[PDB]
Amino acid sequence: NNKQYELFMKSLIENCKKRNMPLQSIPEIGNRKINLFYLYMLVQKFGGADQVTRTQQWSMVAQRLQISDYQQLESIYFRILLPYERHMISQEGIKETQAKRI
C-alpha cells in the first residue's frame, strides 16, 4: 500500500494546482509526508469540513496526526483538497469515483 499515496495524491494535487496552490507547499504536519486522506478519513464522521472544522470530531482528526491544531485541519481538508474529500463520500457523481461498483 505504498503506492496508495501517489493515487489519492494525484487527486489532491490536481486540486491544489486547480485551487491556485492553496498552500504553496505541503503543510507537512507531524514529522514527515502528509497523511491527508488519513486524518481526513476520520473527518468522515462529519463529511463536511466546514462542519467538522469547528466541532469535536475534529479533535479526532486534529489529534490523530499529532497536530492538535483544528485550524491546520481544515487547512488539510479545505486548504489542500476540500472538494475531493467532500466529494468521495456523498456520491461524487456515482459515475467517476465509485461509479456504482463498476
Swiss-Prot record:
It comes from the Eukaryota. Residues 2-89 form the ARID domain. It is found in: Nucleus. Belongs to the SWI1 family. [SWI+] is the prion form of SWI1. [SWI+] is the result of a conformational change of the cellular SWI1 protein that becomes self-propagating and infectious. This conformational change generates a form of SWI1 that assembles into amyloid fibrils. [SWI+]-aggregates sequester soluble SWI1, resulting in reduced growth on carbon sources other than glucose, reminiscent of a partial loss of function of the SWI/SNF chromatin-remodeling complex. [SWI+] can be cured by GdnHCl and by deletion of the molecular chaperone HSP104, which is required for [SWI+] propagation. Present with 92 molecules/cell in log phase SD medium. Involved in transcriptional activation. Component of the SWI/SNF complex, an ATP-dependent chromatin remodeling complex, which is required for the positive and negative regulation of gene expression of a large number of genes. It changes chromatin structure by altering DNA-histone contacts within a nucleosome, leading eventually to a change in nucleosome position, thus facilitating or repressing binding of gene-specific transcription factors. Component of the SWI/SNF global transcription activator complex. The 1.14 MDa SWI/SNF complex is composed of 11 different subunits: one copy each of SWI1, SNF2/SWI2, SNF5, SNF12/SWP73, ARP7/SWP61, ARP9/SWP59; two copies each of SWI3, SNF6, SNF11, SWP82; and three copies of TAF14/SWP29. The prion domain (PrD) is a Gln/Asn (Q/N)-rich domain, which is unstructured in its native, soluble form, and which forms a parallel in-register beta-sheet in its amyloid form. The first 37 residues of this domain are sufficient for aggregation, propagation, and transmission of the [SWI+] prion. This is SWI/SNF chromatin-remodeling complex subunit SWI1. It comes from Saccharomyces cerevisiae (strain ATCC 204508 / S288c). The chain holds residues 405 to 506 of 1314 of the full protein.
